[PDB]
Structures are given as C-alpha cells and as structure tokens.
Design a protein around this motif. Structure first.
Motif, PDB file in Angstrom:
ATOM      1  N   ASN A  52       0.827  -1.204   0.000  1.00  0.00           N
ATOM      2  CA  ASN A  52       0.000   0.000   0.000  1.00  0.00           C
ATOM      3  C   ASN A  52       0.866   1.260   0.000  1.00  0.00           C
ATOM      4  OD1 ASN A  52      -2.750  -0.556  -0.287  1.00  0.00           O
ATOM      5  ND2 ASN A  52      -2.909  -1.250   1.838  1.00  0.00           N
ATOM      6  N   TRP A  53       1.620   1.436  -1.075  1.00  0.00           N
ATOM      7  CA  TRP A  53       2.527   2.567  -1.164  1.00  0.00           C
ATOM      8  C   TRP A  53       1.997   3.634  -2.116  1.00  0.00           C
ATOM      9  CZ3 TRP A  53       4.576   2.950  -6.106  1.00  0.00           C
ATOM     10  CH2 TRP A  53       4.534   1.794  -6.880  1.00  0.00           C
ATOM     11  N   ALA A  54       2.620   4.808  -2.033  1.00  0.00           N
ATOM     12  CA  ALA A  54       2.307   5.948  -2.877  1.00  0.00           C
ATOM     13  C   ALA A  54       3.547   6.824  -2.969  1.00  0.00           C
ATOM     14  CB  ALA A  54       1.115   6.743  -2.334  1.00  0.00           C
ATOM     15  N   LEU A  55       3.594   7.655  -4.006  1.00  0.00           N
ATOM     16  CA  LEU A  55       4.689   8.594  -4.212  1.00  0.00           C
ATOM     17  C   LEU A  55       4.127   9.990  -4.434  1.00  0.00           C
ATOM     18  CD1 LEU A  55       7.126   6.647  -6.512  1.00  0.00           C
ATOM     19  CD2 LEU A  55       7.023   6.672  -4.054  1.00  0.00           C
ATOM     20  N   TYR A  56       4.818  10.989  -3.893  1.00  0.00           N
ATOM     21  CA  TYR A  56       4.341  12.364  -3.869  1.00  0.00           C
ATOM     22  C   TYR A  56       5.497  13.350  -3.720  1.00  0.00           C
ATOM     23  CZ  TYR A  56       4.731  11.690   1.149  1.00  0.00           C
ATOM     24  OH  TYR A  56       5.195  11.406   2.410  1.00  0.00           O
ATOM     25  N   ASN A  57       5.237  14.596  -4.123  1.00  0.00           N
ATOM     26  CA  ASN A  57       6.215  15.677  -4.077  1.00  0.00           C
ATOM     27  C   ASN A  57       6.065  16.456  -2.769  1.00  0.00           C
ATOM     28  OD1 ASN A  57       3.771  16.816  -4.758  1.00  0.00           O
ATOM     29  ND2 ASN A  57       4.578  18.133  -6.374  1.00  0.00           N
ATOM     30  N   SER A  58       6.674  17.639  -2.690  1.00  0.00           N
ATOM     31  CA  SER A  58       6.600  18.423  -1.463  1.00  0.00           C
ATOM     32  C   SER A  58       5.247  19.098  -1.260  1.00  0.00           C
ATOM     33  CB  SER A  58       7.716  19.466  -1.436  1.00  0.00           C
ATOM     34  OG  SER A  58       7.604  20.351  -2.528  1.00  0.00           O
ATOM     35  N   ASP A  59       4.385  19.113  -2.270  1.00  0.00           N
ATOM     36  CA  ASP A  59       3.029  19.626  -2.136  1.00  0.00           C
ATOM     37  C   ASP A  59       2.001  18.523  -1.935  1.00  0.00           C
ATOM     38  OD1 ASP A  59       4.172  22.140  -2.689  1.00  0.00           O
ATOM     39  OD2 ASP A  59       3.862  21.875  -4.839  1.00  0.00           O
ATOM     40  N   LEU A  60       2.444  17.269  -1.806  1.00  0.00           N
ATOM     41  CA  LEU A  60       1.605  16.087  -1.602  1.00  0.00           C
ATOM     42  C   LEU A  60       0.833  15.675  -2.850  1.00  0.00           C
ATOM     43  CD1 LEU A  60       0.097  16.200   1.996  1.00  0.00           C
ATOM     44  CD2 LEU A  60       2.307  15.418   1.201  1.00  0.00           C
ATOM     45  N   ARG A  61       1.337  15.999  -4.035  1.00  0.00           N
ATOM     46  CA  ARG A  61       0.696  15.619  -5.286  1.00  0.00           C
ATOM     47  C   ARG A  61       1.252  14.294  -5.788  1.00  0.00           C
ATOM     48  NH1 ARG A  61       1.270  16.937 -10.700  1.00  0.00           N
ATOM     49  NH2 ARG A  61       3.038  18.330 -10.301  1.00  0.00           N
ATOM     50  N   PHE A  62       0.373  13.460  -6.333  1.00  0.00           N
ATOM     51  CA  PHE A  62       0.789  12.164  -6.850  1.00  0.00           C
ATOM     52  C   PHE A  62       1.674  12.333  -8.077  1.00  0.00           C
ATOM     53  CE2 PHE A  62      -3.045  10.094  -4.789  1.00  0.00           C
ATOM     54  CZ  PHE A  62      -2.280   9.474  -3.840  1.00  0.00           C
ATOM     55  N   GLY A 103       3.413  -4.597   9.412  1.00  0.00           N
ATOM     56  CA  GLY A 103       4.723  -4.696  10.022  1.00  0.00           C
ATOM     57  C   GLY A 103       5.128  -3.374  10.632  1.00  0.00           C
ATOM     58  N   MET A 104       4.914  -2.285   9.891  1.00  0.00           N
ATOM     59  CA  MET A 104       4.900  -0.932  10.436  1.00  0.00           C
ATOM     60  C   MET A 104       4.500   0.034   9.326  1.00  0.00           C
ATOM     61  SD  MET A 104       7.961   1.048  12.380  1.00  0.00           S
ATOM     62  CE  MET A 104       7.987  -0.122  13.728  1.00  0.00           C
ATOM     63  N   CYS A 105       3.841   1.137   9.665  1.00  0.00           N
ATOM     64  CA  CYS A 105       3.440   2.134   8.677  1.00  0.00           C
ATOM     65  C   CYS A 105       4.384   3.329   8.766  1.00  0.00           C
ATOM     66  CB  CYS A 105       1.991   2.558   8.913  1.00  0.00           C
ATOM     67  SG  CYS A 105       1.247   3.559   7.612  1.00  0.00           S
ATOM     68  N   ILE A 106       5.124   3.596   7.695  1.00  0.00           N
ATOM     69  CA  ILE A 106       6.176   4.602   7.727  1.00  0.00           C
ATOM     70  C   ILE A 106       5.927   5.645   6.647  1.00  0.00           C
ATOM     71  CG2 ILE A 106       7.778   2.839   8.519  1.00  0.00           C
ATOM     72  CD1 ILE A 106       9.201   3.206   5.798  1.00  0.00           C
ATOM     73  N   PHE A 107       6.562   6.805   6.812  1.00  0.00           N
ATOM     74  CA  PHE A 107       6.647   7.803   5.754  1.00  0.00           C
ATOM     75  C   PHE A 107       8.116   8.048   5.441  1.00  0.00           C
ATOM     76  CE2 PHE A 107       6.353  10.441   9.602  1.00  0.00           C
ATOM     77  CZ  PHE A 107       7.396  11.313   9.443  1.00  0.00           C
ATOM     78  N   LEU A 108       8.430   8.151   4.159  1.00  0.00           N
ATOM     79  CA  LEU A 108       9.787   7.967   3.677  1.00  0.00           C
ATOM     80  C   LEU A 108      10.524   9.292   3.534  1.00  0.00           C
ATOM     81  CD1 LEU A 108       8.276   5.247   2.618  1.00  0.00           C
ATOM     82  CD2 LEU A 108      10.222   5.113   1.098  1.00  0.00           C
ATOM     83  N   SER A 109      11.835   9.178   3.365  1.00  0.00           N
ATOM     84  CA  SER A 109      12.735  10.298   3.161  1.00  0.00           C
ATOM     85  C   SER A 109      12.884  10.558   1.662  1.00  0.00           C
ATOM     86  CB  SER A 109      14.071  10.017   3.846  1.00  0.00           C
ATOM     87  OG  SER A 109      15.075  10.916   3.421  1.00  0.00           O
ATOM     88  N   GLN A 110      13.882  11.350   1.284  1.00  0.00           N
ATOM     89  CA  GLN A 110      14.056  11.744  -0.109  1.00  0.00           C
ATOM     90  C   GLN A 110      14.424  10.536  -0.963  1.00  0.00           C
ATOM     91  OE1 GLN A 110      16.933  14.838  -0.690  1.00  0.00           O
ATOM     92  NE2 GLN A 110      16.459  15.100  -2.861  1.00  0.00           N
ATOM     93  N   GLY A 138       5.552  -3.613  -3.924  1.00  0.00           N
ATOM     94  CA  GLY A 138       4.539  -4.630  -4.086  1.00  0.00           C
ATOM     95  C   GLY A 138       3.283  -4.109  -4.747  1.00  0.00           C
ATOM     96  N   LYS A 139       2.171  -4.325  -4.122  1.00  0.00           N
ATOM     97  CA  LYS A 139       0.907  -3.871  -4.677  1.00  0.00           C
ATOM     98  C   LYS A 139       0.648  -2.431  -4.261  1.00  0.00           C
ATOM     99  CE  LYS A 139      -3.985  -5.100  -4.992  1.00  0.00           C
ATOM    100  NZ  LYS A 139      -4.558  -3.795  -4.561  1.00  0.00           N
ATOM    101  N   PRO A 140       0.291  -1.552  -5.187  1.00  0.00           N
ATOM    102  CA  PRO A 140       0.050  -0.154  -4.833  1.00  0.00           C
ATOM    103  C   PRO A 140      -1.313   0.035  -4.184  1.00  0.00           C
ATOM    104  CG  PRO A 140      -0.377  -0.452  -7.123  1.00  0.00           C
ATOM    105  CD  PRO A 140       0.182  -1.760  -6.639  1.00  0.00           C
ATOM    106  N   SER A 141      -1.497   1.225  -3.630  1.00  0.00           N
ATOM    107  CA  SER A 141      -2.778   1.589  -3.063  1.00  0.00           C
ATOM    108  C   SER A 141      -3.813   1.739  -4.174  1.00  0.00           C
ATOM    109  CB  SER A 141      -2.650   2.876  -2.252  1.00  0.00           C
ATOM    110  OG  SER A 141      -3.912   3.347  -1.829  1.00  0.00           O
ATOM    111  N   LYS A 142      -5.079   1.804  -3.771  1.00  0.00           N
ATOM    112  CA  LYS A 142      -6.143   1.964  -4.751  1.00  0.00           C
ATOM    113  C   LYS A 142      -6.013   3.273  -5.508  1.00  0.00           C
ATOM    114  CE  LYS A 142     -10.354   1.114  -3.965  1.00  0.00           C
ATOM    115  NZ  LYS A 142     -11.716   1.045  -3.373  1.00  0.00           N
ATOM    116  N   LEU A 143      -5.699   4.356  -4.809  1.00  0.00           N
ATOM    117  CA  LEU A 143      -5.738   5.675  -5.415  1.00  0.00           C
ATOM    118  C   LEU A 143      -4.494   6.000  -6.227  1.00  0.00           C
ATOM    119  CD1 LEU A 143      -7.271   7.433  -2.310  1.00  0.00           C
ATOM    120  CD2 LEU A 143      -8.405   6.258  -4.169  1.00  0.00           C
ATOM    121  N   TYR A 144      -3.359   5.375  -5.931  1.00  0.00           N
ATOM    122  CA  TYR A 144      -2.163   5.567  -6.735  1.00  0.00           C
ATOM    123  C   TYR A 144      -2.066   4.580  -7.893  1.00  0.00           C
ATOM    124  CZ  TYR A 144       2.703   6.386  -7.949  1.00  0.00           C
ATOM    125  OH  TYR A 144       3.862   6.668  -8.628  1.00  0.00           O
TER     126      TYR A 144
END
Ligand SMILES: Nc1ncnc2c1ncn2[C@@H]1O[C@H](CSCC[C@H](N)C(=O)O)[C@@H](O)[C@H]1O
Ligand SMILES: [Zn+2]
Length: 1064
Positions: A52-62, A103-110, A138-144
């Motif tokens: 359940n991952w996603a990628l985004y910029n500094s404005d939180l845009r996909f 296992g754990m829910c994290i938010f990533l660095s650069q 792995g498998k992405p989130s629904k919205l990404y």
C-alpha cells in the motif's frame, strides 16, 4: 555522462488529472528505525518491502516513477517521498499477463533512485532507494494505481519490441522507422498498442525512452546492446523538454533530517462509520416498502325536487341516476379518455343543471392521481389530489361513478396512535379487495398547486356548493381580467398588472427601457422616475422625469453613500406603459423612518441634492422649488433545533421574533460550545440524535414504536438523571427546524437505512409540531433520481402536513456570497403556510427551477438580474474598514482603528469595540511566495505565475507553477480560479467555504493583502454581526461558518412566518 530526464509536460498526456495524498493512521519516520549511515556502497544497504505505497512531491501531489533517475546521480532538483508498510524481503514478483499484518506504517525520506529487473517474460520487479536502505515494491494503493498502470504499459511495449527484434532474429535488421511501422500496424486489442499513427508512436517511444533504454540493458543476451534502435533512441530524446543531471559513482551517507511534508503533521480525523438511524415504524414502513418493491343505452333521471336556479334562469340539481348508479354533489365520476389504453379521469361534482334547450350537464373539478404529480412512484395507489382545472360535460359521457371520500382527521401527538391503528385497518381492507378483485376506493386530503409548488389544505366550505358558483372559475376570470391596460376613468391614471398608476407617483423603470467573481458588474438597478402626464399617441404613452442614483456619478460616491438616496434632475422621457415595474415612495431625509433593519424590506427613498447632467455637479436642491416630496407621512414559538451548528438559523429566527431556541442537538464539542456562547438560555445536548430520540421515546413508554440498535440502547441507558429531566417531551415543542446532512447513493436499502433524514422525520412524527422547517443543499431535489425528495414529501403527507418547496438565492437579500439553498415548509392542517420573501438586491442568477413531473417546472421567486429595488453588495462594502493583518496571525482580541464609511459596515459593527476572530490560516513558505507573486487585478490566478525555480531556507529547490493538468488535450478547462484573488467590486465565491492552504488552494486571497481571508471576513460575507462568537480551533470555526444558513436570509424567512402567525 549526463542523464536526460523528460519533464512532466512531455509525459503528462498519459497520466490522470492531479490528485493528492491523505491518510488516517500514524506513521513512523524512516530515519529512526536504522542507525547512522556512514560511507557505504549502495550494494550493502538493508533490503525490505512496501505494501500500500504511494509517491508524492513536497506539495503532496501524486507523481510518477519516470521523474526519478534510473541510475545514481549527484544532484537532484526534484523532491520525491512516499509511504509504505514495512515487511521482509520475501521475493514477490509481478506477472504482466494478468498480506499486510502492518509490520509498520512509515513515511519515507528523499527518494533518489529506482530500478527494474527482468525475470522471465511477463515477470519483473521494481525497487527504489533512499539514503538509508533499499526498498522493494509490491501492490500499490487503490488511489495511486492510475499512476502505476502507465509504467507497466511501457514495460509491455518494451517486451514486445524485444520479442519482435529477436523473433525476426538478425537482431541488427530493424530500424527505428521499421519498428515504428510494425508497431503502428498492430490491432487495437494487443497489449503493445501505442497508436495507429507513426507520429504518435514515435512520440510515445521518445517520451518514455528511459524505461526502454534500461530494459534493453538488463535483458540477458549479447545481441541487444548495440542495436540501431538502441542508439537511435539515445541520439534522439534531446529535442524534447529535458533536464540534465550528472552521473557519478558515490558512497552514501545521510546529511539531512526528514524533509517529508508529513513530518510534524497530524493525521486527519476518521470518516466515522455510519450507524443505522433511529426511526419510528411509520417512517420505516414508508421507506422500506419502496426499497423492497422498486430499486433494490342507459336511462337517466333527476332524483328529487329542484334546489334553485343558476344565474341564467336554469334549474339546479343535486342527485342524478346514470343507469342504476347514483351521482351526487361531492362525489366523483370517471370519463373515458380518447385513447382506449390509459386510465380514465375522475371529476369532483360541483353543480349540475339543465341547459336552456334540454340537456343533462355537470360541472366538475379535476382530481389527479398521485402517480402523475411530483410524487410519482412514491404515491399511494388510492390517493387523489384536487386541482384548479374545471370541465363541463353532458351526463351521458360518464363511464361510471367512482367511490370517493374526503379524509378529515384530528391533529396532535395525542392522536397519533389511534391514527396508526385505523390506517392499518384500511390497508388490510385494501389488500382484501385487491385479491378478490373488486373496485377501488379513493380518498382525498390535500390540494395540488403546481403554480405555487406545494400541497395545501382543502377549502372545505368552498367545495361542493351546488349553487352554480365555482371558485376556480372566479380565479381564472380574475386572472384574465388582470392582464389588460385600463386607463382609469377618462384620464389621470391607469391599471397594469393590478397596480394603479396615477399622476405624481414615483415608479420603477427597467434600466434598458430608458437608454471570475465578476457577474454583477455592469448590472444596474431600477430607474426611479416621477409620472407627469398622459400623452395621446386608446393606447397611450407616459411622460416621466427621472432620478439619478449615486451609482451614476462614480463608484466611490456609491461606496460612501446610503443605499436609499437619490439625486434630483431635469431630464424627461416619453415611455410606453409596459416598461413600468412598480411603485415606490420618496420622502425628505428628515421624514425617513427611525427603525433600521439590515434586510431593508420596504420601498422608501429620500432626496436632498441636485444633479446637473450638463456639468456633472452635485449641489443643494434649488430653493427655487421642490418636487412635492410626496409620501407626506406574543407569538414566539418554543423551538427545537436539530443539527444546530453555531446558530445561523436560530439567530435569524430569534431576531425576527418567532423562535426561542430552548433545546438544541449538536454532537460536536466545538459547535456546541459556540452555540451555548451565543444563546446562553438554551439547553444544549452534545449527543447523537439517534441516542437522544431513543432516550425521549424511553421516557414516554413508547419503546415499542422505536427502531433502534442495541449500542444506541446502551448509550441511552448511560445518561445522568440530571440530563433526563431536562429532555423535551412531546407536547412542549411547537416548532422544529433542521439542516440534516442528507446524502445520495442508491442503498444496499441497507445503505439507505443509515441516513440522517430518517431520524429528523421521526422527530417530526413523534412530536407533531405546529411548524416544521427543513433546509438543505439545492441538489436535494435531484439526489437518487429524485427519490429522496419524493419520499420526504410522501412521508410528510402521510402525517397530515401542508408542504411547500423552493430554492432561494442568498445574494438577492443583502450578502456578497452566492449560496443556493432548498427549503421545505410544513404546517398543520389549520395553519397558514408561510410565503416566500421578496428579493430586493440585484444578483446575476437565472431563476432556479424545481422540476414537477409531466413537463412542468416551478420557480419560487423572481430573477433580479435586470433590475431590483437596491444596489448589489461588493467586497469593499464588506471588508473595507478592517485593519491589516499578516500571515498566520493568531491574536483573537484586537481593536478597531478606522471608522465605518459604507452602509454595510455601519450595519455590521453597530456599537462594538472589541474585534474578535480576525485570524487567518498560515501558508507555508512556498505557498506564500506564490501568493506574493500574483498581481492585484480582477481574475488573477495561477496562469500569472512565472515559470521559475525557487530556493527555500531548507535548501529545497521547488517549482513555482503548482498543479500540472493540461495533458494538452480536453478533459480540463485551464482550471480557472485556483490560486485566485478577489475583486473589490465583485462578490465572494462559494469556494471560500473552508479555505485550504496547501494543495488545491482555490480563490481565497485578499484583494490587496498577501494572505488568505480571515475568519471575521468570511463571517461578514454571510451576514454574521461583529458581536457573534465562535469556538474551537481555526478549522472548526471555518467549518461552523461554512455550514450555516446566512442570518440575513434567516431573518427574511422568519419575518414571513410572523405575518403568517398573525393571519390565523
Ligand atoms: N447524527 C448527528 N447528530 C447530531 N448532530 C449531527 C449529526 N450528524 C451531524 N451533525 C451535526 O449537525 C450539523 C449539520 S449542519 C446544520 C447547519 C445549521 N443549519 C446551521 O444553521 O448552522 C453539523 O454541525 C454536524 O456537526
Ligand atoms: Zn369551475
């Protein structure tokens, strides 16, 4: 070497419209789960996995994976981060031809790299990197997922090119043009289908070229590394939009803290699960039956003596026999319609007579079936409604006599049980007659008025008179007598639309008959003129002298001056009588009334000055003369507010003198505190209405009429003895108002059972008040194919209410905001249903309409875009005197420094010396820079921002132009209004409802100051006085203002109820 990255504009044609990232669960940051990272080869870092991952910029845009390097670069100008659930490296691969214990829910660095490895055909794997470890995907989130699918499509295309570069073998044979040709001929079902046009194909290949370029390096064979296609793609690519980074081999190490936009940000609240509504069994039956059925030669003689004579000398009778059957005045008959397929029509007998020669004739009133009204499929098979339409036929044209009765039933909560038992008896009798297949029995209780938009009570003394005299016939005759121009007597006056115009009267003339946030600009109000004489041109013309308004000199003089002031002049026009819109009054300034209301509501003006049109000078009225400044001179109801909020409706209904909000039910703490701050004598319940209604029914012994869940039963048992004794029992409530958040979907009925309109309707069913008012959004009349509206009406009609519906616009009553609302008025059988208030300000709205069925529409009030009694209200009229504040000002108590100038700023302030809640939401550094680089002009938005790179205090380099949605094709309209600034001479948009500071900003900036609108400024655009108080944090206060009905509009509505309460 240099690594070419293809900018987002070139690859944007394939990706969806921009959207942003949200989450509800806490995330650990990445950098604490690992120790310090010294100089390490990128080979030796932790390998993990994400789900359940996603990628985004500094404005939180996909954002895509194609905006990150395929290799190791030194400097990166793009800041990309992500989310993920950490797990162990198990070895999952994705199959092209086609577990989370947290296992754990994290938010990533650069994120600084990614990678694709080639297994077997149709089996690949994708891995990414940060400065502390390596992460497999792995498998992405629904919205990404929509940003994941275009990457695999290019994977398929690359695999295909490999296949038919080696299938044909002789690898060094195909050429870029040859590959473009063979790709272009593919059928529109193969997964490698780019397009059937060569140019679109080469566009796609060059734009997405780095994915193919790496896939042509990790595919195991020493036959595809020197291909003509491989070197052609690399020699190309440059002629597109590109950035040039540097490729060097390095040895990793952390240097910075986590610059993720989510660092220090709180998770947003939940989306609290809907619970099944606490209803009564009547409402349950009504709404559940629908969703379990639907969407889941003959002789004739007069019988008796004569009664009297019609006003033509002809006898008048009451009872006639149509071959065995009996026809009586007050009954109903069925006539055979032209086409022998539809059902017959039913007519209410008014009078019967014998015509001059010899005939048997009757006069009937039309009784309509509920299937063909606005009710439609929600109406009972046996309910008929009375209309205004009449008919005269002979007593030989009947098909037969229908069975019909008029249902007059008593009113009150004290009678609602006997009614239920009687209703069940009748329903059982109806089923029995249907199964034996006998005739139908009909009943009537209301009156249908599609031109007034409601169901009104029966005028029981007017119907069925048998006296040759019909009320609807009078009404039609009057309505056709009203539409003739009637110059009274010989001269000196006339009649048009029922208004008598005489000489020396003051009139309203239509502005054209005499000669973006910007929609009232160029819109003018009535011309106020004085009638002088009547000219021959019987059809006549009229001679008028005119008045100039402050609007017509300059804009600043209109800002300064009162809204009821006129300038004298010496200009004359000869006009046709059909340009005249109404009558007003003009007095001297000293004769103006002493009482000032914010919604002005009366047609009075005053004059003191002169306007010389030749020189354009204002000077005192010429003593030489004066223009005969003619016009020489307890009901308050105990109220329950459900879904209260901060009190916008109750403030206006208490100001007008009808409400005293004694009880209220708001389940949120901030809004409840805000309500109790302003109405200190009200009893506030911060509890769900599902538990409150259960407690109320439990306090009366009526726990068997209740449909409730067990958890609500426990919550109602968890009440203090003090709270129980302060509850409203049925008998003590005379007025119920409410704003339920009704919704729209379909149901499963299971998904409809959780809607808050059912509990509101159960409150009305249990208490049975005198008056009932519902407010909601305008889309309410078109939710669920119009089924919620139809069922709401049928529910209110099963109890015995009169019902009325309408859509009103708030800007025509004195505010700067264009809010459209839908209102339903309900009254008992024996009350008067309130009228609709008159709009007296000019607004650019096209007459909101409600669709009655069968090709008809209804509109409640008029449109004021072509002329109204008063001048529109602007942004400078609303926020022109307030002191200057900065970004993120939190000081709640301030002082006033300037005095009022305009009429609105003298109404709103009053005698208030304390300025509260003049606070605004803080924008971060990058948004503030963009707000400062927007010009101070009407209609300035994000198209005005220069294309440039901004360096911040963190060291981050960012992009000035926000969201990128052109996708150079339709499916967008330029997105006008985002990052937008207001206009001093315009009005407030309905997008300043809860301004957002981060992702999709909207039109909320101040016309001259570099900041967002304050809470106080948003409160003045809805008519909230300066003394009104709010509670909570800034977000809750903005929500409280956004959800409310404007207090000016609520005063106008409550002043029409006060007139209806005097007419009883
Ligand atoms: N089940 C429930 N019980 C009680 N209140 C609820 C509720 N669901 C929502 N609400 C509250 O009801 C309000 C609906 S908004 C009603 C607005 C109100 N007319 C006004 O004039 O200000 C919201 O504040 C919401 O917090
Ligand atoms: Zn009639």
């Amino acid at each position: 070497m240099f690594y070419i990255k293809i900018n987002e504009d070139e690859i944007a044609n394939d990706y969806p419209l921009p959207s942003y990232y949200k989450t509800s669960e806490e995330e650990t940051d990445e950098l604490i789960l690992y120790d310090a990272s010294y100089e390490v080869q990128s080979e030796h870092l932790p390998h993990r996995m994400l789900h359940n991952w996603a990628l985004y910029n500094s404005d939180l845009r996909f954002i895509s994976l194609e905006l990150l390097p395929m290799k190791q670069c030194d400097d990166i100008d793009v800041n990309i981060f992500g989310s993920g659930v950490v797990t162990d490296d198990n070895g999952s691969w994705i199959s092209l031809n086609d577990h989370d214990p947290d296992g754990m829910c994290i938010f990533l660095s650069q994120i600084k790299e990614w990678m694709i490895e080639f297994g077997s055909d149709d089996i690949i794997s994708i891995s990414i990197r940060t400065d502390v470890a390596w992460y497999r995907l792995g498998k992405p989130s629904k919205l990404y997922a929509p940003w994941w699918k275009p990457v695999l499509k290019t994977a398929r295309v690359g695999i295909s090119i490999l296949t038919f570069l080696r299938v044909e073998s002789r690898v060094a044979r195909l050429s870029f043009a040859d590959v473009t040709k063979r790709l272009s001929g593919l059928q529109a079902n193969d997964k490698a289908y780019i397009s059937s046009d060569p140019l679109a194909v080469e566009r796609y290949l060059v734009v997405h070229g780095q994915i193919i370029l790496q896939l042509f390096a990790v595919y195991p064979d020493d036959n595809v590394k020197r291909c003509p296609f491989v070197v052609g793609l690399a020699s190309k690519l440059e002629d597109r939009h590109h950035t040039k980074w540097i490729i060097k081999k390095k040895k990793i190490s952390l240097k910075e803290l986590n610059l993720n936009p989510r660092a220090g940000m709180a998770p947003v609240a939940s989306k609290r699960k809907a619970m099944q509504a606490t209803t009564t069994r009547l409402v349950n039956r009504i709404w559940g039956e629908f969703y379990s059925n639907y969407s889941p030669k003959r002789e004739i003689k007069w019988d008796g003596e004569s009664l009297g004579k019609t006003s033509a000398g002809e006898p008048l009778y009451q009872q006639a026999l149509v071959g065995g059957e009996m026809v009586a005045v007050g009954g109903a008959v069925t006539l055979e319609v032209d086409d022998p397929d539809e059902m017959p029509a039913i007519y209410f007998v008014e009078y019967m007579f014998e015509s001059t020669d010899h005939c048997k004739m009757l006069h009937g009133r039309f009784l309509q079936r509920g299937s063909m009204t606005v009710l439609g499929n929600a109406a009972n098979e046996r309910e008929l409604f009375l209309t205004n339409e009449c008919m005269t036929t002979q007593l030989k044209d009947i098909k037969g006599v229908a069975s019909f009765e008029i249902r007059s039933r008593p009113w009150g909560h004290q009678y609602r049980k006997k009614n239920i038992t009687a209703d069940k008896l009748d329903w059982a009798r109806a089923l029995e007659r249907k199964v034996k297949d006998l005739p139908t029995e009909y009943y009537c209780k209301s009156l249908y008025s599609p031109e007034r938009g409601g169901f009104f009570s029966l005028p029981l003394s007017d119907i069925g008179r048998s006296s040759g005299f019909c009320t609807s016939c009078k009404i039609r005759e009057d309505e056709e007598k009203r539409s003739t121009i009637k110059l009274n007597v010989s001269k000196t006056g006339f009649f048009i639309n029922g208004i008598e115009y005489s000489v020396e009267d003051f009139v309203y003339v239509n502005p054209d008959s005499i000669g973006k946030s910007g929609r009232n600009i160029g819109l003018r109000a009535y011309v106020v003129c004085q009638l002088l004489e009547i000219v021959p041109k019987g059809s006549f013309d009229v001679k008028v002298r005119r008045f100039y308004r402050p609007e017509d000199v300059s804009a600043e003089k209109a800002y300064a001056s009162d809204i009821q002031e006129l300038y004298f002049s010496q200009d004359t026009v000869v006009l046709p009588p059909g340009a005249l819109e109404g009558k007003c009054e003009v007095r001297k300034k000293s004769d103006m009334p002493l009482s000032r209301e914010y919604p002005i509501s009366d047609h009075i003006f005053f004059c003191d000055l002169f306007f010389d049109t030749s020189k354009g000078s204002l000077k005192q009225l010429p003593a030489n003369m004066k223009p005969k400044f003619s016009t020489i001179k307890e009901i308050r109801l105990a109220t329950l507010d459900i879904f209260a909020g901060c009190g916008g409706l109750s403030h206006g209904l208490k100001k007008a003198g009808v409400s005293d909000a004694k009880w209220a039910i708001e389940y949120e703490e901030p809004a409840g505190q805000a309500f109790k701050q302003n109405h200190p004598e009200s009893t506030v319940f911060v509890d769900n209405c599902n538990v409150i209604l259960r407690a109320i029914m439990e306090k009366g012994g009526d726990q068997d009429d209740c449909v409730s869940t067990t958890e609500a039963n426990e919550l109602a048992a968890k009440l203090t003895e003090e709270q129980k004794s302060t509850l409203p029992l049925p008998g003590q409530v005379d007025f119920i108002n409410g704003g339920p958040p009704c919704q729209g979907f379909s149901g499963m009925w299971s998904k409809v059972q959780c809607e808050m309109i059912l509990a509101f309707l159960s409150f009305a069913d249990y208490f049975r008040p005198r008056y009932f008012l519902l407010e909601n959004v305008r889309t309410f009349v078109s939710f669920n194919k119009g089924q919620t509206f139809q069922l709401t009406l049928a529910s209110l009609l099963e109890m015995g209410y009169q019902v009325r519906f309408g859509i009103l616009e708030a800007g025509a009553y004195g505010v700067s905001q264009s809010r459209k609302r839908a209102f339903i008025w309900a009254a008992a059988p024996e009350e008067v249903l309130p009228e609709w208030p008159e709009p007296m300000h000019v607004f650019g709205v096209p007459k909101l309409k409600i669709s009655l069925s069968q090709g008809l529409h209804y509109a409640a009030v008029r449109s004021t875009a072509l002329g109204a009694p008063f001048r529109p209200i602007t942004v400078r009229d609303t926020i022109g005197d307030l002191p200057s504040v900065e970004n993120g000002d939190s000081r709640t108590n301030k002082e006033y420094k300037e005095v009022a100038v305009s009429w609105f700023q003298k109404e709103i302030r009053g005698n208030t010396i304390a300025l509260t809640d003049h606070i605004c939401k803080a924008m971060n550094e990058l948004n503030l820079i963009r707000c400062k680089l927007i010009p101070t002009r009407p209609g300035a938005d994000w198209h005005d921002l220069p294309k440039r790179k901004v360096t911040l205090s963190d060291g981050r380099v960012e992009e000035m132009i926000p969201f990128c949605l052109p996708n150079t094709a339709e499916r967008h309209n330029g997105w006008k209004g985002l990052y937008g600034r207001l206009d001093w001479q315009g009005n407030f948009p309905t997008s300043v409802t809860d301004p957002q500071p981060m992702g999709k900003v909207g039109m909320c900036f101040h016309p001259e100051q570099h900041r967002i609108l304050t809470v106080r400024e948003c409160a003045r655009s809805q008519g909230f006085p300066d003394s009104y108080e709010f509670a909570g944090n800034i977000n809750h206060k903005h929500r409280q203002i956004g959800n409310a009905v404007p207090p000016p509009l609520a005063f106008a509505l409550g002043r029409k109820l006060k007139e209806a309460l005097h007419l009883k």
